């Protein structure tokens, strides 16, 4: 029994391939092989084109008050600041825009084959 | 990006994750998608660690401990990193060139995957 | 008729008339080995010529008046025919008190002021109250402010509404100018030369050479070097009171690295004590005090208060007291509070031109108001209701 | 630049995590308050009193270089800041960054 | 060498902190009424009994304590085994052992 070889290298070498997130684009928008076994043809072709969110619907849901509580089953301003509120509402608008853009981005791609086709073509 | 000052999952399963990130320019409270909690737990993120979170993907990287806690022990095997200087929320508009071969090789083999076949691959 | 404004601090008494200027006078008696039987009182310290080995007789212990005889003697000297010639029976006095003042001290203050001197009317407030009143007079659009009073014997942080003090959020730091001076004495005695009997000279040294570092560890690394690159290190010539009346710092061009000088001056070399001593205000745990510093205490006090008011408090941080005169104090406070303050809330820290006399100016302003007569307590009302109504009216 | 702690172990204490470690040279002795990661590293590599070890502070890399009561105990300061210089070939960088655990290919071909 | 228990270290720290509040280090040159503790014990001031003096004492800091050398003040990686004092170099250790370790000279 021998001790292993301890190979010492510069700490900078281990970060050679690393790229900061602010310096790289999202490669998940071209991920076709990741959709196989997870995304179905129904989702890509029939559901998402009909039930995609819109900016109007998102804004309406965000601005509207909380829904009433679900019924139980039955067996049958001195300290107000204008600048702070303007900043907060701008932040809320930006958050809603980000939610919309991300929801559109995460369902844009359709599978090459899809779960239904693969299941049909897969013999026991 | 910033030092983690609070990490509180909100139970209804987990409805959302409330995180507190600190920078030199202030503190920001963020509501996280519950899927990011798995990434936070895998990375072993605790209070006082300097992390960044990608808004579009939810990726979390714990890039060391804050140097304000460097004296909490006399001998720990930790990498202590300065507190980030800018704002917690950083926006940059970038233009990156990729080639068709990059997308081909990116779609030739799967990435990640918690299955046994993926791990052995 | 006239109104007397007094800031009975543990170190300096800011005493003056409402219609006149302000004078800074030490509020303690002195004894020296150059005088066999002679106790100096208040500003009489100017008369002595060899303040080395000076003995201090203080009326305050841990920032509260505990010794009544020396304070009485100092007041009699200040109110006597030599200083101000106060007509007690027809004069109103505005005198400051420490925060959270004990009941017994308040009873003794009221009794002495209303019986031993028989003042026409007395108004007891806290220095922070006067500072807040002055700040609100200066800034009429602001509804709230937070006052940081880093003084001789402690450092309080008090938030003030427009006309009320949030007693629930008052935070006290047990670090003051006295503690810093004693720590500097101890450090110098342990390291270079014994100066434990030179409180006056070491206090002047602290006032002259110390500063607050923006980057603590960069300054430590710079000080650890030897040669030209050690810009932090300076040479101080202590006053011998024979040919050097007051201490001074040698010019950098005249500095000698070896440390030996042909002139027989007793030279005290300070490199890391320049910023280690002021840092105790921001990090009490450096010396062993398990208490939060000024910025963390400010943020904690503000965050204890309701959420709606918080942006108003963060926008109006005011620094008062002697310790605020350190170079770099304001920048360090602003940086730390900005680091801890939520990003959506703006942070503004204001350092007045004379933080020593801020409370005195506030008292002068509050004397000139038309609501002054309702605040004070008269002797005629003192006779019957005084002992209860002093507690009732004064928001100590 | 790295911080390297080289000395002789005097006493190692681990309690249910907190721990203390006492190290000595011929000129100075010190007790350290240990963190969780360094405690785990010292548990993984069996360290007992009398062993002469060197620790890389940032990584916990502990290598036992003998026992003293055989290598003589270190003389000077226990904690030393050292400048380490590495010359890494472009091939080495490529192989290390080619895949996870890719540095193994520098020794077994398989690039 | 000898080892000092927690009580001795706490007493030494308390004594140094109280000594930092001393008005003067020497005695009266003339060589021939209460104190704060007397006022506290007379006030009978109880915790959680409203806003008062004791409740206003600042709490422990969140940031951990930073060690400094007991001799020269520069940062100190080392802790003395005997007394728990911090130090940074062999020279500083020798000075501490000669001056303030064990017996307080
Ligand atoms: N330029 C300066 N730099 C640093 N410290 C200073 C300076 N000038 C005065 N001091 C310190 O200021 C302190 C006295 O400040 P004051 O607030 O006036 O004290 P005081 O208010 O009379 O006593 P308290 O704390 O209110 S009971 C002393 O400890 C001095 O060392
Ligand atoms: Mg004062
Ligand atoms: Zn040292
Ligand atoms: Zn010791």
Ordered list of secondary-structure elements with their pairings:
This is part of a larger assembly, with chains A (124 residues), B (121 residues), C (396 residues), D (111 residues) and E (105 residues).
Chain B: E1 2-11, E2 14-23, E3 26-32, H1 35-42, E4 49-53, E5 60-66, E6 80-81, H2 100-106, H3 116-120
Parallel strand pairs in B: 5-6
Antiparallel strand pairs in B: 1-2, 1-4, 2-3, 4-5
Chain D: E1 2-15, E2 18-24, E3 29-34, H1 36-44, E4 51-56, E5 61-67, E6 79-82, H2 90-96, H3 105-108
Antiparallel strand pairs in D: 1-2, 1-4, 1-6, 2-3, 4-5
Chain E: H1 6-19, H2 36-43, E1 78-79, E2 86-87, H3 90-99
Antiparallel strand pairs in E: 1-2
The structure holds phosphothiophosphoric acid-adenylate ester, magnesium ion and zinc ion (2 copies).
Magnesium ion is lined by residues 7, 9, 127, 151 of chain C.
The CATH architecture of chain B is Beta Barrel
Subunit arrangement of the protein: part of a larger assembly
- In total, how many beta strands of chain B? 6
Which percent range describes the beta-strand content of chain C? 15-25%
PDB class: gene regulation
Keywords: Chromatin Remodeler, Snf2 family ATPase, H2A.Z, gene regulation
Entry title: Cryo-EM structure of the human SRCAP complex in the unbound state (composite structure)
Chain A: Helicase SRCAP
Structural write-up:
Chain D: It is found in: Nucleus matrix; Nucleus, Nucleoplasm; Cytoplasm; Membrane. Chain D: This is RuvB-like 2. Chain D: Belongs to the RuvB family. Chain E: Residues 1-8 have a biased composition (Basic and acidic residues). Chain E: The modification Phosphothreonine is found at residue 55. Chain E: Zn(2+) 2 binds at residues 80, 83, 96, 101. The structure is cut from a larger assembly and holds chains A (124 residues), B (121 residues), C (396 residues), D (111 residues) and E (105 residues). With 124 residues, chain A is mostly helical. Chain A has 4 helices and no strands. The longest helix of chain A is centred in the last third of the chain and has 24 residues, at 82-105. In chain B, 17% of the residues lie in helices and 34% in strands. Chain B has a 6-stranded mixed beta sheet, with helices on one face. The radius of gyration of chain B is 17 Å and the shape is globular. Chain C has 396 residues and is of the alpha+beta class. In chain C, 36% of the residues lie in helices and 19% in strands. In chain C, strands 3-2-1-9-10-19 form a 6-stranded mixed beta sheet, sandwiched between helices. A 5-stranded mixed beta sheet of chain C has the order 13-12-11-17-18, with helices on both faces. In chain C, strands 5-4-6 form a 3-stranded antiparallel beta sheet. In chain C, β2 (12-17) and β3 form a beta hairpin. In chain D, 18% of the residues lie in helices and 40% in strands. Chain D has helices at 36-44, 90-96, 105-108; strands at residues 2-15, 18-24, 29-34, 51-56, 61-67, 79-82. In chain D, strands 1, 2, 3, 4, 5 and 6 form a 6-stranded antiparallel beta sheet that branches. In chain D, a hairpin with a 4-residue loop joins β4 and β5 (61-67). Chain D is elongated and about 45 Å long. The two termini of chain D are 31 Å apart. The chains are: A mainly alpha (124), B alpha+beta (121), C alpha+beta (396), D alpha+beta (111), E mainly alpha (105). Chains in contact: A-B, A-C, A-D, B-C, B-D, B-E, C-E, D-E. The interface between C and E is large, with 61 and 41 residues. The structure holds phosphothiophosphoric acid-adenylate ester, magnesium ion (MG) and zinc ion (2 copies). Magnesium ion (MG) is lined by residues 7, 9, 127, 151 of chain C.
């Amino acid at each position: 029994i021998t001790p292993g070889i301890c190979f010492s290298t510069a700490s900078l070498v281990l970060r050679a391939t690393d790229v900061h997130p602010l310096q790289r684009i999202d490669m998940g928008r071209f991920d076709l092989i990741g959709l196989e076994g997870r995304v179905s043809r129904y989702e890509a072709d029939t559901f998402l084109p009909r039930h995609r969110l819109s900016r109007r619907v998102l804004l309406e849901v965000a601005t509207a008050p909380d829904p009433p509580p679900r019924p139980k089953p039955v067996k049958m301003s001195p300290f107000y600041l204008d600048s702070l509120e303007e900043k907060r509402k701008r932040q809320r608008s930006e958050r809603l825009e980000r939610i919309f853009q991300l929801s559109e981005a995460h369902g844009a791609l359709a599978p090459v084959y899809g779960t239904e086709v693969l299941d049909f073509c897969t013999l026991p | 990006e910033g030092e983690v000052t609070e990490l509180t999952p909100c139970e209804t399963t987990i409805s959302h994750v409330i995180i507190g990130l600190k920078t030199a320019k202030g503190t920001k409270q963020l509501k996280l998608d519950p899927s990011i909690f798995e990434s936070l737990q895998k990375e072993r993120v605790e209070a006082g660690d300097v992390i960044y979170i990608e808004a579009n993907s939810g990726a979390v990287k714990r890039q060391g401990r804050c140097d304000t806690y460097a004296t909490e022990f006399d001998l720990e095997a930790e990498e202590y990193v300065p507190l980030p200087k800018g704002d917690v929320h950083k926006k940059k508009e970038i233009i990156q060139d990729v080639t068709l071969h990059d997308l081909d090789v990116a779609n030739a083999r799967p990435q990640g995957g918690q299955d046994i076949l993926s791990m052995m691959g | 008729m006239t109104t007397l404004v007094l800031d009975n601090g543990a170190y300096n008494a800011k005493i003056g008339y409402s219609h006149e200027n302000v004078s800074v006078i030490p509020n303690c008696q002195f004894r020296s080995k150059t005088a066999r039987l002679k106790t100096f009182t208040a500003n009489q310290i100017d008369e002595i010529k060899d303040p080395s080995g000076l003995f201090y007789i203080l009326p305050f212990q841990k920032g509260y008046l505990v010794n009544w005889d020396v304070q009485r003697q100092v007041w009699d000297y200040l109110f006597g025919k030599e200083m101000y010639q106060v007509d007690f029976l027809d004069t109103n006095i505005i005198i400051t008190e420490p925060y959270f003042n004990f009941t017994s001290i308040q009873e003794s203050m009221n009794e002495i002021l209303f019986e031993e001197y028989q003042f026409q009317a007395v108004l007891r407030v806290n220095a922070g109250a006067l500072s807040a009143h002055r700040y609100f007079r200066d800034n009429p659009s602001e509804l709230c402010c937070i006052i940081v009073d880093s003084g001789y014997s402690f450092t309080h942080i008090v938030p003030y509404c427009r006309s009320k003090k949030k007693k629930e959020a008052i935070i006290r730091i047990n670090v003051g100018g006295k503690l810093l001076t004693n720590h500097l004495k101890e450090i110098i005695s342990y390291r270079q030369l014994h100066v434990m009997d030179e409180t006056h000279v070491i206090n002047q040294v602290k006032e002259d050479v110390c500063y607050v570092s923006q980057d603590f560890y960069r300054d430590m690394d710079i000080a650890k070097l030897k040669g030209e690159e050690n810009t932090v290190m300076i040479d101080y010539v202590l006053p011998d009171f024979s040919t050097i009346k007051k201490g001074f710092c040698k010019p950098r061009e005249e500095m000698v690295l070896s440390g030996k000088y042909k002139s027989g001056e007793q030279i005290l070399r300070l490199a890391n004590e320049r910023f280690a001593v002021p840092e105790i205000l921001f990090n009490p745990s450096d010396i062993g005090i398990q208490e939060m510093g000024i910025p963390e205490a400010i943020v904690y006090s503000i965050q204890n208060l309701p959420e709606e008011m918080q942006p108003h408090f963060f926008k109006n941080i005011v620094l008062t007291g002697g310790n605020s005169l350190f170079p770099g104090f304001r920048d360090r406070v602003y940086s730390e509070v900005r680091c801890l303050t939520p990003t959506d809330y703006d942070v503004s820290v204001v350092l007045p031109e004379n933080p020593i006399t801020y409370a005195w100016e506030g008292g002068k302003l509050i004397s000139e108001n038309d609501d002054f007569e309702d605040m004070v307590v008269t002797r005629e009302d003192y006779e019957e209701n005084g002992h209860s109504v002093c507690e009732e009216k004064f928001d100590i | 630049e790295t911080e390297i702690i080289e000395g002789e172990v005097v006493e190692i204490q681990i309690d249910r995590k907190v721990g203390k470690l006492t190290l000595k040279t011929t000129e100075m002795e010190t007790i350290y308050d240990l963190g969780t990661k360094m405690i785990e590293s010292l548990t993984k590599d069996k360290v007992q009193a009398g062993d002469v070890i060197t620790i890389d502070k940032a990584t916990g890399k502990i290598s036992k270089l003998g026992r003293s009561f055989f290598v003589q105990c270190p003389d000077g300061e226990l904690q030393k800041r050292k400048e380490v210089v590495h010359t890494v070939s472009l091939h080495e960088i490529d192989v290390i960054n080619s895949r996870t655990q890719g540095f193994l290919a520098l020794f077994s071909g398989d690039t | 060498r000898r080892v000092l228990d927690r009580a001795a270290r706490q007493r030494r720290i308390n004594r140094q902190l109280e000594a930092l509040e001393n008005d003067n280090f020497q005695d009266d040159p003339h060589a021939g009424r209460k104190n704060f503790q007397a006022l506290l014990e007379e006030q009978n001031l109880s915790v959680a009994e409203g806003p008062n003096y004791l409740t206003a004492c600042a709490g422990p800091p969140s940031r951990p304590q930073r060690p400094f050398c007991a001799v020269c003040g520069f940062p100190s990686p080392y802790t003395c085994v005997s007394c728990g004092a911090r130090y940074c170099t062999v020279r500083c250790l020798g000075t501490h052992q000669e001056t303030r370790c064990l017996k307080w000279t």
